Each structure stands twice: as C-alpha cells, then as structure tokens.
Amino acid sequence: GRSLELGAADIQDLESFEAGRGALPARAYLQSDAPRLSLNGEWQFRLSPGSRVAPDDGWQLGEALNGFESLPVPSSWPMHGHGAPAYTNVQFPFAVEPPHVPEANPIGDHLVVFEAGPEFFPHALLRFDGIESAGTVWLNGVELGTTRGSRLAHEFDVSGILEQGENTLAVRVAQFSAASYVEDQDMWWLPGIFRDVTLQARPAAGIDDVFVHAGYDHITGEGILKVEASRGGQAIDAVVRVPELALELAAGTEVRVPAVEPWSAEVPKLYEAAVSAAGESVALQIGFRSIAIEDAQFKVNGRRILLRGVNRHEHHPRLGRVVPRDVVEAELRLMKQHNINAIRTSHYPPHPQFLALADQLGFYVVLECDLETHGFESAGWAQNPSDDPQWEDALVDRMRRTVERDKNHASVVMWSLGNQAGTGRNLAAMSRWTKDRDPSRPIHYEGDWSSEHVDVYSRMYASQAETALIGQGIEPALNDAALDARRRAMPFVLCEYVHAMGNGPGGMSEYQALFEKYPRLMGGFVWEWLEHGITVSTADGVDHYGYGGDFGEEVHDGNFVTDGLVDADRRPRPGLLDFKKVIEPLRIDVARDWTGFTLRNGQDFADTSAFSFRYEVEADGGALDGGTVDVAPVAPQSETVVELPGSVAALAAGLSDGRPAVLTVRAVLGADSAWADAGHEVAWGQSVREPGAPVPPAPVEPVQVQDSELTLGPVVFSRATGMPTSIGGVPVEKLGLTLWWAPTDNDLGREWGGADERPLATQWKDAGLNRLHTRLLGISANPGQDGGETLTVRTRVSAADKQYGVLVDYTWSTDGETVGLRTQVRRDGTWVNRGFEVEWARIGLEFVLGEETELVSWFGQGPHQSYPDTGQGARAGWFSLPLAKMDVEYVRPQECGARSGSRSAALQLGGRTLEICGDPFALTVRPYSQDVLDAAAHRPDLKADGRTYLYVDHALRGVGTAACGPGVLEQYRLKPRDADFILTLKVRS
Amino acid sequence: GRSLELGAADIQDLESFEAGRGALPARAYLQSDAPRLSLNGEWQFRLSPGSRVAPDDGWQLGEALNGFESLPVPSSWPMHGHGAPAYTNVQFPFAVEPPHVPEANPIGDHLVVFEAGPEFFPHALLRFDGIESAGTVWLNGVELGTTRGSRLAHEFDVSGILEQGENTLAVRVAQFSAASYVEDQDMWWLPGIFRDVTLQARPAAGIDDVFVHAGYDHITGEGILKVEASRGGQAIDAVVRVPELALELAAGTEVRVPAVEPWSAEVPKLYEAAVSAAGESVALQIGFRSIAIEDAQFKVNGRRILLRGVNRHEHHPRLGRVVPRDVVEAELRLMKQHNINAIRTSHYPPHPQFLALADQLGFYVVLECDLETHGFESAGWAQNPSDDPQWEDALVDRMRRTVERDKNHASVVMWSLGNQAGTGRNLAAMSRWTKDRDPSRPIHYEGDWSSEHVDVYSRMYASQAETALIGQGIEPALNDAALDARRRAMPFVLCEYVHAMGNGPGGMSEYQALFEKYPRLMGGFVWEWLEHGITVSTADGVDHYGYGGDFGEEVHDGNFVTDGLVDADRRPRPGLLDFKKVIEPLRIDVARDWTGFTLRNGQDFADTSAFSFRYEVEADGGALDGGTVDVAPVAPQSETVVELPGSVAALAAGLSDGRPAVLTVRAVLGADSAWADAGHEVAWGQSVREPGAPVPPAPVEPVQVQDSELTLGPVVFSRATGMPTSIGGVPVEKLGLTLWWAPTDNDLGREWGGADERPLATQWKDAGLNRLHTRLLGISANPGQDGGETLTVRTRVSAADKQYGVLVDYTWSTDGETVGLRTQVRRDGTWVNRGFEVEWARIGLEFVLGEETELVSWFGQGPHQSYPDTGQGARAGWFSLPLAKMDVEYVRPQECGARSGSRSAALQLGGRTLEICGDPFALTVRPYSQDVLDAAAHRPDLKADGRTYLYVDHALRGVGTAACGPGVLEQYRLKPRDADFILTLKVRS
C-alpha cells in the first residue's frame, strides 16, 4: 500500500525553500499615471485550522461559498475574532524542525469580486504589498503564483487571465510556512493580507522600474543626477524633467546641476521631477545627498551626523500590522516634535507609503530586510537558515525585493540585512548582492560582530563603558588582523539601546555625552518607539492593553512586547519626554547671575535662524517678566553667549534672599513647520534661585499625656505604637520607614556579572524588603523651649527571619502651627542575605492617611516623574495635578510617579490641605498601597481603598535598563547606609 | 523627660533568658492515690493583639469581665477562631533579634472558677502540662509564677493561697517570647494552654518523686531492681511491693530478682508495682530491660536491635496540638499494625499519657527535649542560643524537666537533647547533666556530627551510599583523632530518613537491605508519621486539608507540613502500606515449584509461636486451594524451610501452561493481641505463574478507505490526524505519546550535586515536556494476511522552540475482534536543554475517551499505587476498584495512582468494557487531565470533565525522596532512549 494522508500537496509547498513562483521582476514602488484600481475593502473569508482539512471545494470560483463571511482587507485576521494574537520574543511557537510546519496552522481563504474596465486591457498586473506568511493566488480560477517574504511586495501579470468586466480573486494564506523560520522578530504573530492589494494597468511604451541617483558635491555645491528608466528589464528612451532646476535630460545620462540645495533630515529639500515615456509617466521626489565613510565617521554631504533614532515597528492596538495612514503621519510628526531625526525599520521594510513621508518630514532611515532567525540561537545556531545553502535563493530574494522597492528615496541612508540572524554564507550573499546593486548606501548588520560584510560597526545595548572605549578606538582587537583593521576604520552605531520598557529608560545622558564627544560614534536608536499593546475591553466597558499570555498562548513572553516610548495609541511615556530633552539639538546654559545664556548649535547642517529665543521669570505667584531676544544665526557646531535684557538680572538681584524663582530660556519654532506649529518647544535651559532652607519650628509646645494617647500641638500619637494617629484633624492610619518599591520591568531582569544573577526584585523578596516590621523600643519627651518639649520615638525595623535591621528615631517638635519631624536611620548588623549584599530601593517614609486626596501640588521637577537616572525632561517650577494624573499608565502596573527634587508639596484632602517642606525629597501620592501595585498584572487590578498613600523619600535608587541591557549605573545605586533628614508638616483647614 | 511607652513590664518578662519562676522541683509524672481535680473544661478567654494593649483591669479576680467569651481548655486557640494557625518550616515568623518579641504578639487571658473541697487542704498544687509559649498564673489574684518550655510540665504550690470553696484561676499566655527562639520546630505555630490542668492534693507523709531502676541480666535472667522515693527532695521510708514477683522491699535498696521476663518492644512484659508511704501511694508499671553499647552496636537485653521507627508529632486536624486520648490509642495501634516498633518524639516530649501507652503496646522511644534553633542556621548560627552563655540555665531546665518527667518508663531507650539546634556549650551542659542524672539511657543528638557529647552517631537523610560506608566503618575520619575513635565505636542511627512527602517515599528497600546487613546500623525513623493538615470547609460543605499559606501567613512554607505516612485523620498513605512491607519482621520466600517457602525470623527476641502461617492459591476465577501449615517455632535471627502440602505443588504442575495463578503465603496473628485482632497480617510472600504473552491478532481485516475516515475492523481513524476517533463504539478524542507527569512534591525539590540544581519539575518545564506537539509524517496501509492490512501512522513529537524530538510509529492490526497496536519510539536529535540532558518521567500513551469510567479492574500489582522504586506493599493478584478509589488524596494534587506491573486491564464505560493486554505496563485512569492535575493546589480544584484519561506506560521514572534527601536512585532514572512495545485492545458491549 501507499499514501493515505490528506493535504500533502499544500504542505509540500509550505515546506518549500524557494522564493515563491510566478511573480514579475522586483521593482521600485513608483507613483505612476497608469490606471489603477485598489481592491481593498470587504472581502469574503473562511478559516481552516490546518492544510489537511482546508477544503478543496473549488471556492476559488467564488460560486456557492459555504462557511465564508465578511472580513476587511487589508487586515491581520486574528484582530477580528478569527483565532487570536500570540506573542513570543525569541522562542518559536512551533517545534523547530525546518522547513516543516505544525499541524495547527490557520489557513485563511480570501475572495473578492471586482470589475475590470477597458483601461486594464490588454496588459495589467495584481500587486500585493504584504501577506503573512505564505500566499497562493488565483484569478478566475487560474493560479498566478505564490508569495514569500511577509513584508515584501509581489506583482503578478494577469494579461490574458483578467477578463473584461467581472473578475474573481482568490487568495489562500497560511499563517505558518518555512518562511516563519526566518521571520522570528520580537512581536505578535499575525497572519493575513495586511497591506494594500492593487490592480494596475501596464500600457505599452510604459515604465516598469526607475533608479534615481542624486548625489551632492559639498565642495562645489553641484548636484549629480542620473535617473535610470527601464521596461521589461531593458533601459528605454524616457525624458526626465525637473522644473525647479530648469532641467530636461534623457534617462540614463548623468549630468551635473550647477547648484542644488542638499537634502538632510534637518533640511529635507526635495525637487519635484517626472520621468515619462509615451505611454506612462512616473512622478518622483528627488533629494540630493551623498553618503560616505571617512576617518571612521558616517558622513552625509561632507559632514559627520548624529543619529537621534528610534526603532519603529508597525503596529496598531486594534488592527495589528495594519497602521492607517493618518496614524503614520501623526506618529512621524510626534517623533519630529520630540527631536527625533532617524528611524530603523525594525525588522522589515515598512508600508511603501512610509518612504515618501520620511523623505518629506526628514529622517535618516535604516531600511531593514525582512529576516530574523533569532530562535535558532538557543540551539547553538544549529540549522540556522542564514548559513544553510538551501536557503540562499530565498534570502537573496528577500534582500533584492527590499532594495528594489525603496532604492529611490533620499531618506534611506543605510541598508540592513536583517536582525538577530546569526552569521552565515547567505548573509554574505545578501551583502554582496546589495553592494553590487546599490553602492551609494552603506550596509548594516549587527549579528556578525566581526563586521566582515558590512560598512559600519553596529552593536545593541553595549554598556556606556564599552561605548566609550569604542568611541576612542581602543576596543579589544579581533583575532583576524585584516578584519580588525577594517572594523576599526568603521564608524560605530547602536542600532538598539536604552531599552525603554516600563519605568525608564535610565542612563540616557551618559550615552549622549559620549555621542557628542567621540566622532566615531554615530548615535543610537532607542528600543523601541511604541508598545505593541492590543486593546481589550470588558463588560464594564473599561479599556486596557493586553500583552503576551492574555490571548491563551501556550508559549509567550508576557509584557516584553510593551517596551516603548509611546503606548499603542501613541500616548507619550515619560521616557519619551526625557528622551526629547536628552537629544535636544541646541544646548542652552543659563548664567547663574541671569545676565545671559550660552547657546551651542548642536545641529549638523542648519543654523539657528528657524528658532525664536524666549525667556520668562516665574515666581511663587506667577510670571514676573518675559520676552524675546534676538540671536544672530549661529552656525552648526558653533557657540555664542547671548545677553539677556538688563531687567532680568536686576530682577534676580532684587529678590528677598529666600524667595524661590526660576528663569527659563527656550528655543521654539519661529514659524510653522511641516511637523509642528510655530511656538513648539525644541530646546530649553534654566537657572534657579532655590528657596531657603525651611525653619524648624521653635519647640515651644509641650507634650500632653493621656492613658492611651499623647498630643503635641496638632499631632495625636497612639501611646501604644508611638506613631501619629492624626495631624491637624486628618487621620493617619500608619507611618513607617520604606526601603522597597513595587519592582519595575527593569528590576525583574537579570543583571549579568557577579555570582549573583537574581533580578533585583528577587534579591528584595529573598531579603524581605517588601515585608518590613517595626518594633517599638521606647518613647520619651525632652525639654524644648519655654516649657515646650520634643517627643522622640525609637524603633527598629527589620523583617521576619532576618538578623539585620535599621534603627529609626522620630523626633517631633511643634510650635502649635507647624510640625517638625527629624528622622535618623542607622544600620544594625550587616545587610547581607543569601551570601550577597542587600541593596535598597529607597530611604523614605510612607504616610497612610484615612482620607482621599483630590489634588497634588509641589515645587520641584515636573510635570512628569523623575528618578535619579531619569527625569531629564522634568524642569524646575510649580506644578499641580489631580491625583489620577500623578500616576503613569504602564500596561503592567509598577513603581512610577515619583517626583524627585521636590522642595515643597501640598496635598488637598477635601477641605483640609496638608503641606510638606524640607530639604529636597521625592514625592509620590497614590490611592492604593504598594502591595496592591506589585500584585496588579493589568491596570484594572488597581483599586482605590479610600486612603492616601504618601511617600516622602530622602534617597532613591535609579531605574536603569536591566530588562535588556545595562542595569543602574554605579552612581545611582543605593547600598544600605546611615542617613538623617528633616521635614516640616502643616495643615490648613 | 523619661519613659512613656506602655506595657514595658510585660515585655521585659517575655524577653527574659530565665527558666521561669515560682515552680516546684521538676519531677516524674506519677499515678498517685492523692485526691485530684481536673480543671479542664470551658474557661473564659480574651485575646489582645499585643502586650502594650493587653488590659491591666484586674481581670484576674474574675469579677466584671468585659470582652471574655467561652473557650475550651486544653486548646490551641487559633483552632477556634481566635487568630489563625501559621506554618513555617525553618524561617522564624518574626524578626530575628533575641530575646526581643514583635509588637504583633497574641496575648490570651484565660480564667476559670472551681471548687476546692477539704481534700485539698492544707497542701495542694496546680499542674500545667503544657503552655505555648509563655504563661503567667494567678490564683485568687496572687501570682504563682511563670512557665517556660512549651511542651514541659510546671507545678505551683497553692498552700495558703487556695481557699476553701470557690477559687479563681487566671492565666495570661503570650504566643511569642524569648522561648520562641528555641522552639523553631517544623510545624504550626499554635499558642494556648494545650494540655491538662490539674489541682492535686499533697498529703503529709506523701511521695513527691520516684525513680525506677529495673535492669536485666540476660546471662542469669535476673532482674536488678531499685526504686527511689523522695519527699521534698529527700529520700524517705517507703515500701515497694511487686505482687507478681513475690517482692516486698524498701525504697532506696537494690535487689536481685532471681528470674524476670524482660521488657522489649516485641514482648513488652510489665510488672504491676506500688510504692507507698503513710499518706500517699504511687502505682507503677515496671519493665525490666538494660541498654548498652558494645562492639559499635546498640543493644537491649544483650542483643542488637533493629529500629523500625517513625517520627511522631502531636497534631490534630481540628484541635491543633491537642490530641485526644482515643486518637493516641488508635494511631499507636495503627503503627503496630504496620510493624513499627520505634518512635521518636519529634521534637519535644509528648503528652505525659503517651509514655504508659508506649510501655504497654511496645515501642522503643527516643524521648526528645523541647529545643530547636533551626532558624539561626541561615545566619551562620550567629546568636544561636545553644552556644550563648545567657541561655544555659533555660536550656538545662528544659532538659531537666524532660528527663525527670519520663525517667521511669522502660519504653524510653534514649534521651535526645533536641533537634537542629547547631552546636554549642549549652548542649554540652545538657548532655553532662543528663549523663550524671540518668546513666541508664544513651544520649542522642544529630546537630553535632562530631558526636562529642552523645553516645550514638545520628544523621538525617544520609544517602543510601553513605549509610553503606558507615555500616562498614569506613566513613571519612574526623579531624580530631580522639573524637574519631569515639564516633567510630558508636552505633549509627538515622533519626530521620526516606522523607514521606507526597508520592513516595522511594528507595526504602535499599536502606533496609543495609540495615539487615550491617550490625552497626541501628535502623531509622521515617519522617514523618502524620501530615499536619488542618481541616477547612466551604459553604458547599466540602472538606479539604489546608497547609501553609491557606491561613493568611505573610511568611510560610506551603505544603511541607503535609509530609506524612498518614493524613491528619490517620488515613494511611500508600507510603505506609509500602513501609509496613519493607520492615516486615519475617521474611517469606515462596519456592517457584510451590513445594514450600523459606522462613527467616527477623525479630530480635520473639520466636514465631505468635503467628499462624496460611497459604492460598488464587486463579482467574478465584481461590483454588488453601489452608494452614504448622511451623516449629523458629528462634530469632534463625532460618528454616517449611514444606507446603503436596496438593499445592501438584496444583501448580497441572495448569494449562498459559493460565495465571498466584500462591500467597502469609504470617498472621494466631490470637488477638493488644494492638490487633487474630488474623491480622504481619508478613507475606508470593510466587506467580505469570500469564503467557498475549497473541497478536492475525491481520486478516483490511483497511476501508473513505474521504475523511479510515476504518480497520472496530477502529475508525480520522484520516486527517491518523489517530483513532473510536474503537468499537467508544469515542476516542485524542491519542498521543506521553513523556511527562504532574510533578510530585519530590520533583519540586532541588537535587543537589552537578551544576544543575533546577528541580526536575523545572527541568521539565524548561524542556517543554508538558507541552508536547505531534506532526503527522505519513499514513500507509500494508499487506497483512488473506487480504487483510496493517495501518502504520508515522509521527514526530516535540515541543515549541525545541529541535530535539522523538519519532513514533503506530502499527494497527485487527482480526475484527481484538485490535493489535505496536508502538515504536526513536530519538531524533540530542535531548539536551539549557545545557543539561533532559530526563523523562515516562514512555507511555494517553488515551482520552469521550465517556466516563465507572470501574477499573486489572491483573498486576495492587491494590494501591506502585512506581519503580515504591510499591513494595503492592502484591500480585486481581483487583477491581471504582474510579474515585483509583486516585490518591494527597493534599496538593500530584502524579499518583499508577499501577505498575499490570498484565491486563478492564475499563467499564457503562454498558461497554474496554480491555487492554500486552507485556507488562503501568495503568492509570483519571476523570481529569494532567494539566488540571498539575494546576490544582487543593483537591477541590480537581473536576471531572466527562472523559476518561487512560495512561498506558511502557516505562516509568522513580519518585525518590528529593523533597528532602536523596533523589531517584540511578537504576530508577529514565533517560531518553529508543523503545518499542506491543498492546492489544478489545471492546465487549
């Protein structure tokens, strides 16, 4: 007997190493006057759980369809109730045995009917800009071919198949195929026809492909122009016209434009052009720019540039991989509004419409091929497609389609072979093909650290320390002298750094100082631009983002998909506010005497003519003075000192010697730009006259003693515990020391190095920092002033089963009006647990009040959160926010919302108002406890309990980027130590 | 100013290093004719959360009590709604800063009123047999004293305080005190007055203490008798009478009884005696026995003994530390019924009534002092009370009270200083005091491996391998030559071994063989006798046991308190059934020809006269022959061969050469004993004629092919998957390979050694063994016989993200009646993950049937579960049980219920009956899946889903004792390997 299994034919095709069959030559995405009909819209769709059960019932004819239902196209079909999204980071969701596919393989059959007028005859084609991951296509029942390369475009000739009038298009899509083994990016698995489908006419004497070459000679200022045009792979006679430059030339000839204005991310000058043959005309946007590497520097138009980058995935919280155009435009505007100038298309080519937007708004684009075999690493890279000769044609095809589609856009300054694909022969073949095809753009690929087949040295998450050694050209040498000589002559780029997951990222300033200091350093791209949160609702109607595991995944990686500077709806996270400041292209150093400010132009090409420089002096009441000062344009990388009007300094000299006041100088847009309105803030700097130290109240009030209570002015103490039970009428339910916070995503990551690789969160739990207990040692009153007394309460704080502890003494004093509180902390015993030193999250106090807080106001850093190694974007001033807005809406709740650098605070408990002053402290106010915060997996898990949780911290730990990359830097760590700090409290009813 | 805190006086007393004040001389627990009044019953009780808030409102007078309510005494008050139980193993539930106590310290005020008649005047006392942990006692308002030593007795003189008529007793009990630091046993923390309270009259010319000395001369057979009696610490004139021995002697004089019958656990001969003065008489039970160590052997009455022991805690699932007397008697009977002969009072003296029961029923008792400082280990033993001079008086007091109370009982053969208390000067002081006081009993203590201050070498959980080296006297030497010479001359005891947590314990047989082989080995005590489950109910009324964490504990150790041979209600676990067989005191080896059996008397003193030897031959239908055979008494440690009646062997010779049959020889009690009825089984042995190999059915039926289904006789296959969808009408929902089981408690423990210390359960999860997936490679029919065909289904099984897999081929054959299934397993790729070899739990098949199973029957080992390194108690025969009874009711659900050694099985699905035959396999049937079993934390989490989960295993892993002690032994491990095995199936409707 012979075979009896079902569907072996479909599965054999899915297991194919080949690049897909039947498609036209890969070419550029071109704006053409040829008639076109978009087939996007409502299609019919049927889902089958595997190939062996996918019906073979002639559905491709579209007649008598059973089981089909409406579905929009383009779409990621798990976003519409057909199956569910599934998130994995590295691990494959199927057994690793290439090229084989699992039995559980969603098969989607798509069908649409459309009308083809006489414009699409004799010749036309069908274009698919993306199918995840394996498509088969029929038109009127005849097979056109298949598609491989989920984020790449495929075109099929329908001449003689397309019929006048009604036509029926059928597409079978398999989620998984052999191609899934090379599409293992860290993101959601989402099958579907997720990009545009277009019917295009191909008139005779038309234009199939165009290759624009627009160089710039920064010495002469000339533009070097050659525009290739071809039909069916052969060069053709066509006319290229550039009206603005008074140019008419034949395609295929190189000319020298006497003077062009060069293209850059800062000044994205574009010239409108058209290349036309008898039967077709293509409209182009030409940006003249040349890219070169010399003296170990990445240079554009003769100047080293600094990349202020992000890694941009394509994701939408409700449509999956389908990003509507208005979302693309909005988010690119938002990037510019935060001083971003570079984008890495992690880790695949974007929607083809993205390229023209990058050209127009101004971004340096690393365009990356759709290739990642990350899941093979855990097996020592055994069977890695990148080094398997059977995969060469498939991988070269991926690179070719990547290069051909976008080769005409000035914004693309580097080609990238892929991401986390190891090293191998097929990667070298992709580089060789690209170098031969387009030598005008350097090659990028991080996976091969030897850098044998690339033109820049790229790394991800290298420490600040190692980056400094690379910046100096003193990194350790490669074992191969020839390769080392090559790599040392390359400029260095961080294709991913300062992982922006949750609270953070920390340590951005230390990287940036190196970027500004060492020319070899090209800059870096933050990981990543957006969180891939998927919107989920409840019968309550409450909306929250879901992540890995929230969709039934047998195998997932949790919330590592929510690791962005903005949430899935492009709401900024605090890290973006800080990032904007870190990469600001102008440096403003306000003089302490308020006479002027130093201004350095950090841009690479533009001067300062685009900015209006404005100043304001704000005080306790409000603004005292302000205006605008004229600055002679400052050349790029140049420096000057700007005088402020004499009234500003005189105003500084006239203050009371205790009055706080802030002078802020800002650089805003003088006029509307393509990405923001006039007045938009780009850079800023401050100088502060800080408020004098607060006066401790004279201890003139005595301590009144009762059986179970002590009273000292407005404070009533529980005589049993020694802690206050109310201050001026507001109930105090608990007061104690804090040393711990609800772990951030970073605290949950392993900090490599040392024999201790427990995450900091685990070190804390093992140490008991989350379950502190306090023992009362004694209560004592002492002589103060004029019959007054101070009340000292001695305690020891520790945790169950631990011998180490801390002695805490609270000294209370009052004049009847304000309350003086002095806290003294002293280590008792060695703070070591499980053989390693315990580290602290904080040294602070937790006040639990028995009433809710409606409003929180403070003088310090704001408006958003700030921790020791973050908060660059938090400026000095007076701020006020409702309680809900003090919080930060991370998908997985975690420590957040602390306002470091606070000098004074005011909580409003309805009619009463609680004020806190003292030496600089961090402020946090929450309607729920830390234990509720730590336990919560999603924001709906957080509930108010009618209380106010007030945190006053004398010291804080940094947050770092330990979820992926460096942990907290040394200077921001918090090791157990003795400490003392003073506060003052007061209630206004 | 000076102090203002509350309750400093009470707290100062709780923090005291002293042994408690005001009590009478520690003495023996004596049965006296002096009038006594038990004050047990309903008391009044008030709970306060700490000393600083415990009222000082004169409640001791019992007048005008506010906040008091009824509570029984004795009691563990968290067992009655006042607070809650809390379980920790090693870790202290409070900060470790001796002698200080936490602010959260439940304070229980107890009060009772009683009448004192003229019998209690002039002199009387109050006796407290246990208070956890610190008691203060007032009678009619006057303080008698305090108590320390929670499981020790205290007596207070009330002469001149006790008043004629009504009296008021008030007791304040603090849960925590300085004493808690030395009472860190692995058990529930349970405050309360948990043992009897008694008013005793002390007539003039009475007897306060008695010290019985009853030695035995095994050469002459003489008894060496001296009975000390004293009053107020001075020897007194008193008469000792022993009627059975015709003895009248003065107390304080040693005499030589010409002939006594010696006492042993096997023959606990006791002589009734009375010692009397003018005003009081004490009734004693005297067992003549002498204990000695010679030639590195622990000897009683001149013979080396073998300890068949358990560690006995005192626990009740609803009363806490209060064990009712009828429960004590029942559980001690149950121990004897399972061949146990020794008890360790882990880790404190038991209720005083326990000692007379041990004397009467016959146990070798290690009586252990109330001392354990385990929680100091994690800090390098810093501050350990065992070596702190300030604790010497407190610890000597503990030992003194321990020794004095029970010194008169023959069952106590060793004194133990404590448990897991490290090493230190105070332990040496406790040993020195004990040696001087009672030299007739050797000293035990495991904590000091050098054994400097003990008379036996004790260890816990030493591997079988190290035990064998110790048995041979070739263990590694101590650095001190003098101490090494001493320890090598000591016999060796395992005070705890084969940890009996969950499924297990495994490896009991390997220890036992060493015990029988090496005289130096004294035996061992299983950890532990009982699970400390606490009963919990729901509104449903369903009862289940709770463990650590189920009572709100901030700090707990989960289900490690449920680690016993019986559950809290004394229901046997399978481990006890196996243990009974492992330690059976007779060895019965049935001859293969059924002519007779070898019989070895494993006892140390008794012959075989107490046993009736019975035989039976059981066959498929039922019993064929049986009767009783007369055995001449066999001396201890002697051997003989017993002939069986000729009809037995002739019956063996006459069987069909394929018929299964079992000959069982049993040793039962010939007459009622004190611990069981006549006919109770003590030892057994078997000889089996196994059934012939099953015949594979002739493959005469062909394979019928259809579009979506294949049929081969009674099996219908899904043509898409290749798996059967029904066999003879019973629906099959899934069929696949298994390599994993729901981790046992042992699988969750770390196996120390090797660079891999992940628990086996974690190794499995990391390896994906719990989430296997199967890919279909092909289906093929082949020529069988006379037009019949066999159907082969080739598959590959792996898991997501893994490259290793296994190829599984199912060959199906049928003659129309029975179904022949051959399974072939072959490794594909190296089964390595996270750098270490993957191990398998099993090689088997899981059948998921679409109907429920009411009954499971099989021929194999039973009735209870058996795994490769367990099941010693499972004997060969035919068994049948309802589905619920196939399961094992472990508190935390886990893998259990497998019946290894099965030759045939019959599941009844209502009207239809599914039969499985084949070479030996393991059988398991469950109404729920493995994923539900693994997820379940308590038995209510298990739910039936209307299906039958049938597991047929060709190979199984052992279970070991890795939760604490050795993991699975080498010969029971299951490393990935190729395998093949045949089965036959058949349905009877």
Ligand SMILES: OC[C@H]1O[C@@H](O)[C@H](O)[C@@H](O)[C@H]1O
């Ligand atoms: O090496 C550490 C291990 O040592 C063994 O002897 C014993 O099972 C335990 O103490 C365990 O912790």
Ligand SMILES: OC[C@H]1O[C@](O)(CO)[C@@H](O)[C@@H]1O
């Ligand atoms: O550049 C054009 C290239 O693209 C392909 O057509 C893929 O369809 C190849 O056949 C050709 O080489």
Ligand SMILES: OC[C@H]1O[C@](O)(CO)[C@@H](O)[C@@H]1O
């Ligand atoms: O014609 C523009 C470009 O496209 C090709 O024709 C092939 O697609 C190339 O030969 C040319 O460089």
Ligand SMILES: OC[C@H]1O[C@](O)(CO)[C@@H](O)[C@@H]1O
């Ligand atoms: O053996 C009697 C011993 O017991 C104690 O009374 C404890 O109350 C000690 O005072 C005495 O030494």
Ligand SMILES: OC[C@H]1O[C@](O)(CO)[C@@H](O)[C@@H]1O
């Ligand atoms: O009297 C019996 C035993 O008890 C004591 O009197 C003290 O309690 C000891 O002197 C004696 O050995």
Ligand code: NA
């Ligand atoms: Na996050």
Ligand code: NA
């Ligand atoms: Na991620």
Ligand code: NA
């Ligand atoms: Na258990």
Ligand code: NA
């Ligand atoms: Na235990």
